[PDB]
Amino acid sequence: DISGLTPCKDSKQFAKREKQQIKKLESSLKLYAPESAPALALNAQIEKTKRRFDNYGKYGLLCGSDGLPHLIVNGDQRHWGEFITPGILFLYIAGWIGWVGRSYLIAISGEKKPAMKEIIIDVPLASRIIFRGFIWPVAAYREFLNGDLIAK
Amino acid sequence: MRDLKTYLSVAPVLSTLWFGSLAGLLIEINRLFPDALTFPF
Amino acid sequence: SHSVKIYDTCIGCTQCVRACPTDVLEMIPWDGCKAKQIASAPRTEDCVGCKRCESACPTDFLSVRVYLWHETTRSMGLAY
Amino acid sequence: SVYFDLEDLGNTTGQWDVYGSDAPSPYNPLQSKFFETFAAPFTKRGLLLKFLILGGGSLLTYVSANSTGDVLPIKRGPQEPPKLGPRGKL
Amino acid sequence: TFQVVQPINGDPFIGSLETPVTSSPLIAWYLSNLPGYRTAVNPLLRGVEVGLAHGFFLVGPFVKAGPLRNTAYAGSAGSLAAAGLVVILSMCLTIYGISSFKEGEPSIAPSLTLTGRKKQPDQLQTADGWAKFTGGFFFGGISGVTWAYFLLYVLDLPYF
Amino acid sequence: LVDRDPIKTSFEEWAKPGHFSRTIAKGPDTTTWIWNLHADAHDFDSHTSDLEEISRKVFSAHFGQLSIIFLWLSGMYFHGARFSNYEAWLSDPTHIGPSAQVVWPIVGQEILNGDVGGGFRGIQITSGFFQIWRASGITSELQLYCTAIGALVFAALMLFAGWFHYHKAAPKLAWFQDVESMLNHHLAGLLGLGSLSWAGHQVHVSLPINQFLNAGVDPKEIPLPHEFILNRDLLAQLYPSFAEGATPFFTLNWSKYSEFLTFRGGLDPVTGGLWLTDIAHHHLAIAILFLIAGHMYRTNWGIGHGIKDILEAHKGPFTGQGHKGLYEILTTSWHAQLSLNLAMLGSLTIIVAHHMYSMPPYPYLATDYATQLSLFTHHMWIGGFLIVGAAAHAAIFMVRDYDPTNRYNDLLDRVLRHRDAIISHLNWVCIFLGFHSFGLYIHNDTMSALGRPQDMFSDTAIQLQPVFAQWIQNTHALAPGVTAPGETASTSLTWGGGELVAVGGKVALLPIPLGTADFLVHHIHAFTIHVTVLILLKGVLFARSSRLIPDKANLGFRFPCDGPGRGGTCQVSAWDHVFLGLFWMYNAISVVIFHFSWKMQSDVWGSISDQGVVTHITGGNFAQSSITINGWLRDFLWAQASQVIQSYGSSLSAYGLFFLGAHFVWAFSLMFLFSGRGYWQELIESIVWAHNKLKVAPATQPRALSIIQGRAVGVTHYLLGGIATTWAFFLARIIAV
Amino acid sequence: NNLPSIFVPLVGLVFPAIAMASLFLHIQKNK
Ligand code: CLA
Ligand code: CLA
Numbered sequence A: 001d002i003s004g005l006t007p008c009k010d011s012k013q014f015a016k017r018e019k020q021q022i023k024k025l026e027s028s029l030k031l032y033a034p035e036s037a038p039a040l041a042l043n044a045q046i047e048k049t050k051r052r053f054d055n056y057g058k059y060g061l062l063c064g065s066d067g068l069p070h071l072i073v074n075g076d077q078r079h080w081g082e083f084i085t086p087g088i089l090f091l092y093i094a095g096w097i098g099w100v101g102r103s104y105l106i107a108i109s110g111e112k113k114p115a116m117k118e119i120i121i122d123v124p125l126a127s128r129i130i131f132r133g134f135i136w137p138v139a140a141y142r143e144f145l146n147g148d149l150i151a152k
Numbered sequence B: 001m002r003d004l005k006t007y008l009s010v011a012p013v014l015s016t017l018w019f020g021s022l023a024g025l026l027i028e029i030n031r032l033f034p035d036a037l038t039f040p041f
Numbered sequence C: 001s002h003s004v005k006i007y008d009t010c011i012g013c014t015q016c017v018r019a020c021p022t023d024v025l026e027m028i029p030w031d032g033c034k035a036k037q038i039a040s041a042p043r044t045e046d047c048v049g050c051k052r053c054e055s056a057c058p059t060d061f062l063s064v065r066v067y068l069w070h071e072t073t074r075s076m077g078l079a080y
Numbered sequence D: 001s002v003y004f005d006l007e008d009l010g011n012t013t014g015q016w017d018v019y020g021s022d023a024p025s026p027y028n029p030l031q032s033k034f035f036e037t038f039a040a041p042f043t044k045r046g047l048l049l050k051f052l053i054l055g056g057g058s059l060l061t062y063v064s065a066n067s068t069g070d071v072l073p074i075k076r077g078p079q080e081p082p083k084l085g086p087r088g089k090l
Numbered sequence E: 001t002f003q004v005v006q007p008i009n010g011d012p013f014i015g016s017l018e019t020p021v022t023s024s025p026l027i028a029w030y031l032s033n034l035p036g037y038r039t040a041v042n043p044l045l046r047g048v049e050v051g052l053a054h055g056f057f058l059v060g061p062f063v064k065a066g067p068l069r070n071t072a073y074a075g076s077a078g079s080l081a082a083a084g085l086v087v088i089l090s091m092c093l094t095i096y097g098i099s100s101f102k103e104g105e106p107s108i109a110p111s112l113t114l115t116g117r118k119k120q121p122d123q124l125q126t127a128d129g130w131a132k133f134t135g136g137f138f139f140g141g142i143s144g145v146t147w148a149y150f151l152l153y154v155l156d157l158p159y160f
Numbered sequence F: 001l002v003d004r005d006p007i008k009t010s011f012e013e014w015a016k017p018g019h020f021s022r023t024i025a026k027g028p029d030t031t032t033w034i035w036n037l038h039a040d041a042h043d044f045d046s047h048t049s050d051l052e053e054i055s056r057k058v059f060s061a062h063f064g065q066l067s068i069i070f071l072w073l074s075g076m077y078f079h080g081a082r083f084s085n086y087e088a089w090l091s092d093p094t095h096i097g098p099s100a101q102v103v104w105p106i107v108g109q110e111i112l113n114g115d116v117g118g119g120f121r122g123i124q125i126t127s128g129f130f131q132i133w134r135a136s137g138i139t140s141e142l143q144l145y146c147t148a149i150g151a152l153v154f155a156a157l158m159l160f161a162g163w164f165h166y167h168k169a170a171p172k173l174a175w176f177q178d179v180e181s182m183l184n185h186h187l188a189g190l191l192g193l194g195s196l197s198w199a200g201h202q203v204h205v206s207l208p209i210n211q212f213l214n215a216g217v218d219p220k221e222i223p224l225p226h227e228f229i230l231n232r233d234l235l236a237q238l239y240p241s242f243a244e245g246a247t248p249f250f251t252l253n254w255s256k257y258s259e260f261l262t263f264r265g266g267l268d269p270v271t272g273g274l275w276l277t278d279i280a281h282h283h284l285a286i287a288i289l290f291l292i293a294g295h296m297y298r299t300n301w302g303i304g305h306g307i308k309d310i311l312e313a314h315k316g317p318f319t320g321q322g323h324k325g326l327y328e329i330l331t332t333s334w335h336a337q338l339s340l341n342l343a344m345l346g347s348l349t350i351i352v353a354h355h356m357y358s359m360p361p362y363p364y365l366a367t368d369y370a371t372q373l374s375l376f377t378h379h380m381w382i383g384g385f386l387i388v389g390a391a392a393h394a395a396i397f398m399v400r401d402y403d404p405t406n407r408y409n410d411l412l413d414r415v416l417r418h419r420d421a422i423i424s425h426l427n428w429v430c431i432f433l434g435f436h437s438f439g440l441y442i443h444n445d446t447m448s449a450l451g452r453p454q455d456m457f458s459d460t461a462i463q464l465q466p467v468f469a470q471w472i473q474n475t476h477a478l479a480p481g482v483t484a485p486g487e488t489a490s491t492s493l494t495w496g497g498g499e500l501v502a503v504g505g506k507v508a509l510l511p512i513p514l515g516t517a518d519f520l521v522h523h524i525h526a527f528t529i530h531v532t533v534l535i536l537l538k539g540v541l542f543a544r545s546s547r548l549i550p551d552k553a554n555l556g557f558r559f560p561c562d563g564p565g566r567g568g569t570c571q572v573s574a575w576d577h578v579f580l581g582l583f584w585m586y587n588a589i590s591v592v593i594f595h596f597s598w599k600m601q602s603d604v605w606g607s608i609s610d611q612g613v614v615t616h617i618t619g620g621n622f623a624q625s626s627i628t629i630n631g632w633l634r635d636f637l638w639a640q641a642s643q644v645i646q647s648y649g650s651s652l653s654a655y656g657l658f659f660l661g662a663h664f665v666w667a668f669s670l671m672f673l674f675s676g677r678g679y680w681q682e683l684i685e686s687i688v689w690a691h692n693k694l695k696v697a698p699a700t701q702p703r704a705l706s707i708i709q710g711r712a713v714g715v716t717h718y719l720l721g722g723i724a725t726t727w728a729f730f731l732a733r734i735i736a737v
Numbered sequence G: 001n002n003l004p005s006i007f008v009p010l011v012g013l014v015f016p017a018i019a020m021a022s023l024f025l026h027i028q029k030n031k
């Protein structure tokens, strides 16, 4: 119970929110015949709501006094999935994008009119460069060690 | 045609194609795995 | 009246005197450049300050500079 | 078709009196004499300003000080019992 | 072909035009007879006339639109407000005359007519002339306000 | 007068951006090149000086515009057949809200598929297409599908024509300058024949189907439109005059056609709109009048008029030579024609917007409040934009195409010689109107705050009655039987006849009273319009020169300034005057639409009961609350915005999101308007430094936006944010109630 | 009391006029 929080599965307000949403969804269903397509859509929405609430209950989130999940970003191992892992994934993807852009910019710097290759992309060269960014951390680290990363 | 291929490499067309593919991929990913709040694996 | 100054980075292409909306600037003979010319500002009392001369200078930083100063009835462009 | 002259710059610069009239006085001599006799003291611009300031200050202040509530509602004052504010405050 | 609008006094390079609104004989006669355009008359009399005309005017709006318009003190309050406005205008005229004109200098009014004839400049554009004009204006304004109040609320004339 | 294959069809110019200009085609040294590429895309006059080539380029783009419009119409017609409840709405127009858009459920956006009736889930539309389709006799969806297919075919045809008349056979210059033939054709054929064809369609299709529908017959049991043509017995049963055929027409016995060609006036009690027989008679008469009008101008056969001859004969003792020389200006400059057409079109759009609401032409349109409000606001905004564009292009013509050496005109010369008087008089009028219109609102606010309600300008303390407009209303209410003997009822129910029309328990139209508040709001409208006119006319008149900058014409139509000299010369060009007048146009149109909305909600719209008592939406508070600014802030802005701020969790949450989005967009524009270029250029220098440190500096040097570009971005974002906010607020308020 | 009936007009109508007249004369002066 970090900061006085409670698990989702033990919170009564969470169940009350689920019941209120389900009841609101079921009210509009009575206006349509069971075989009609809007009835099928509403049934699918109700099933999706139930599945979402069950999944939130299963993942061990923490609820406040209002029955809403809260995110812990202090580094506890019990909550590494809320902030740490997606952060690492985002950092990897952003580094990939930045490394690809920098490599493409460096490659065309020696051409006679480099500004022309920036508005009309050299597709084969970019495609050959795109796959290289999959190992961007190693290349960046070794470039830093050799003193090539920073312009003199 | 070389001149037709050159027009497909201009910045707006390439950006539009890239972003359309990106949005399609993201929409499909969210359709397969809806309502994601934490990384469970 | 405004202040107009000329610096010895002049190349004497006569571009400033042609863009003058009044008669302020003129060219005099000189030695120190290939064109053997340099600009001058003998009539700064007619300066209005639109800074068209600085829009025509080809030198990296301007060889002609206009410093706005005390305003008169001529430098404000009034025809009341 | 000559509109420029150096010996006559009044016409060159258009220094004309468009509507000024040089006709003599149309008023009666007796009425004019009465008006000059009785309106003379106000023709000194040094004393007129001081007289105007003093008269405006004295007349405006005297009227306001002796005003009756039948004219100014603020001179009458409140005529109803007060009401309590929020949280039972005066 | 006949044309109506003409350049001012035949000079096309002066920033004015001659139109029926400006150069009609009726309008020319009407404007030349106003007290502000009688350059050969004592400024005191013109000031008195202007003050009387303007003071008679100012009573009505103050009387009919004032906060005490629906009470028994409408006329007195309106007349007092009109007198106060006349006093303020007299102060403004005195200040303008003090600030604009200097003692001992000649008049700055034009000394040429439209037909080229020479004439004496108006004396209204001097310190003494403006002081006389302001005094006459004050006297005439007070007198006109008093006359309007007397006619409206001392004699039971069937107005309106 | 055409040329065979002027320009080869190739993809070569596609790979070379900026080919239309010599400077732009050089290459992108900086980022200003990209912006300059788009700003000069459609300025054909800058590309070349040949009038024939400019005319040929102009002719082709209109075909693309028509193709785009046809594609838009095809989409609108197709969506009403596949994703709409039009058939369900047709059997109950008073209890079902029209809807023609559905949403895919992905991220919880399926909440927007709210219930609208007829067993359908979707977004409620307010474009009024359902009423148009009903008034045309459309019953099933097959007809809508056929219309969509035809519109697609027409769009393809327009695109092919656009390609052909530029790459295969381009007309010569002498073809374009045949103004008499163009006027004759556009009058006799485009308008008269179109009106005649629509009158025929209304006579043969719309009338019987609409009569059957108004009789209460099930739409699926109504005979198809072709059955009324092949079987004249049905029409004879519906209209006995059809049994005589066309014989009365050719014998001038036109009185027999009075059954389906009437002069009734007023509204149909069943539907709440104008009688369709009146519309058919109107279209027939208009077709005849336009057909007659198209035979005035001379052509190859001698008879007719010459426009030059007509123009050259009008001159006066005040205007000199008069209209001589105006024919050559209008047949050589494209910008003057564009300005005149834009002004006329904007005025016509405003007139249409005013006329549509008080004379409902479609069935079940008066009782659809959201559609009425949306159409009114939309058409007013379009008219305002067109009016502004008129002045913009007039200034463009003044800057570019004016040449007294070869195109002298006496009327234009006389106007330019006394512009100071015009500008000064307009300035005085604007100041006087602003003082005596807005000042009365501040007086009322001060008197109300001080506790003196008896000293205000109101219907109970100091009345300012619009006696002139009331006289017009009285005259028009008494028009039938005295000055219009052939009419049975008045043209509009708002004149003050006293009769009320109720459809489905709601009030369609009724007399509209005029009081003290209408006086103030009308004078506010006049003040705003006068200020906008002042700004635009001052911009147009001083486009070439002034006492401050004698050579303003040499600097061009679109330049930022002329330096800090003469005390400051910021925004002296004619472009800046349009940039400044757009704000005032926005202000005036917003005030007008607010007046319309509040007045209709307070005094017209409402519900009626069995005993016949009317309960309006806001309870008739416009008369006593609109006389103060606090009243406008409280009873209109605060009270009516509770619908949009409480739309979360329902089908109207999109309007709630758009409210805040438009707030953000409007607030974002102030960065570009309040700041200058030098700061942003100096800030970029620091950002470029760190990119150079990491070898990521682009060769296309980043440059800050130009002054003109910054002003344009600011004004565009400002207008977009304001209009989107008003749109979201109006729709969210009017759909719920 | 009766003081506010005097000091309020004295500060709001008389002194501003005197100050404005004196300041206008001072700023319009020349030698
Ligand atoms: C801050 C100082 C101040 C003060 C003390 C006042 C006081 C007053 N104002 Mg006022 N006013 C002010 C600022 C002030 N105002 C400002 C800043 C504005 C502009 C927004 C106005 C605009 C305004 C309007 C539009 C009106 C007033 C009116 C009034 C009077 C209320 C009605 C009344 O008693 O009628 C009784 C009035 C009389 C019996 C006659 C007027 C009072 C004296 C005797 C007139 C002569 C005074 C003096 C000789 C001339 C000035 C001398 C000079 C040195 C100042 C009251 C005397 C109302 C009024 O009636 O004005 C005439 C009115 O209609 N005011
Ligand atoms: C029949 C209508 C019509 C026509 C044919 C023209 C034609 C023309 N106008 Mg014009 N104009 C019109 C109406 C019209 N105007 C109106 C109504 C106004 C008043 C608002 C103006 C105001 C105006 C100005 C101020 C100027 C012109 C200019 C021009 C000329 C160059 C056009 C150009 O390069 O634009 C290029 C077109 C664009 C850059 C597109 C603009 C993009 C818009 C503003 C933003 C839309 C926002 C959108 C909703 C967001 C989606 C973005 C998307 C990428 C996601 C051309 C002859 C120019 C000229 O003659 O200069 C010498 C010029 O300076 N016009």
Ligand code: CLA
Binding pocket: A097, A098, A099, A100, A101, A102, A104, A121, A126, F686, F687, F688, F689, F690, F691, F694, F696
């Ligand atoms: C691949 C290109 C690239 C790279 C490596 C960088 C790298 C950097 N930028 Mg940057 N930037 C770029 C493009 C790039 N930028 C573009 C195109 C813009 C204009 C929108 C900017 C605008 C910008 C600003 C305003 C600032 C930076 C700053 C920074 C530094 C802080 C790190 C960061 O995340 O800033 C944040 C980075 C961004 C917000 C950039 C947005 C992401 C862009 C759109 C990605 C586009 C990549 C491009 C399409 C490459 C195409 C590759 C293809 C040909 C294969 C970092 C050195 C900051 C700094 O320290 O100042 C020097 C700073 O204040 N950048």
Ligand SMILES: CC1=C(/C=C/C(C)=C/C=C/C(C)=C/C=C/C=C(C)/C=C/C=C(C)/C=C/C2=C(C)CCCC2(C)C)C(C)(C)CCC1
Binding pocket: F073, F146, F147, F148, F149, F150, F151, F154, F193, F194, F196, F197
């Ligand atoms: C809606 C729409 C559409 C459609 C349309 C249509 C379908 C139309 C039609 C139209 C038509 C269908 C038309 C027609 C016409 C006709 C006419 C116009 C005729 C005329 C005639 C005449 C004029 C005659 C005369 C005469 C005389 C006078 C004498 C002798 C006798 C006679 C009779 C000959 C589309 C798809 C595009 C899309 C969009 C929308």
Ligand code: SF4
Binding pocket: C009, C010, C011, C012, C013, C014, C015, C016, C017, C038, C039, C056, C057, C058, C059, C063, C064
């Ligand atoms: S001042 Fe500038 S433009 Fe003039 S001569 Fe020198 S360098 Fe050339």
Ligand code: SF4
Binding pocket: C004, C019, C020, C021, C022, C024, C025, C046, C047, C048, C049, C050, C051, C052, C053, C054, C066, F565
């Ligand atoms: S600032 Fe203007 S007026 Fe002065 S010298 Fe330069 S160009 Fe001439």
